[PDB]
């Protein structure tokens, strides 16, 4: 139905992170590679 109060309340606090954005034609597309970040040095394979 017309229940437009799905989630728009407060727009909570943002901060600034090291993020890599690219311009694929039109879209502003995020892009990050993550082995050294969180897949590093365990016995879990990378997906």
């Amino acid at each position: 139905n017309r229940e437009t109060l799905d989630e728009l309340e407060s727009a909570p606090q943002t901060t600034r992170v090291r993020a890599d954005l690219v311009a694929i034609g039109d879209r502003l597309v995020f892009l990050e590679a993550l082995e050294r970040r969180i897949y590093a040095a365990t016995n879990v394979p990378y997906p």
Binding site: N1, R2, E3, T4, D6
Partner: protein, 49 residues
């Protein structure tokens, strides 16, 4: 123990309207109205050039 089941939010689309004049094609048309069509039965243009 307790045991409930859940309806976790539901989401509906908002279907859009289109004014045809709010579209780039209508420069090729002349949107002119005529409230008494169904009795007009004929029409013509005699085109002097």
């Amino acid at each position: 123990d307790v045991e409930f089941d859940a309806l976790l939010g539901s989401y509906c689309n908002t279907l859009s309207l289109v004014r045809f004049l709010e579209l780039g094609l209508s420069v090729a048309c002349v949107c002119t109205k005529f409230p008494e069509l169904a009795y007009m039965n004929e029409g013509r243009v005699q085109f002097e050039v």
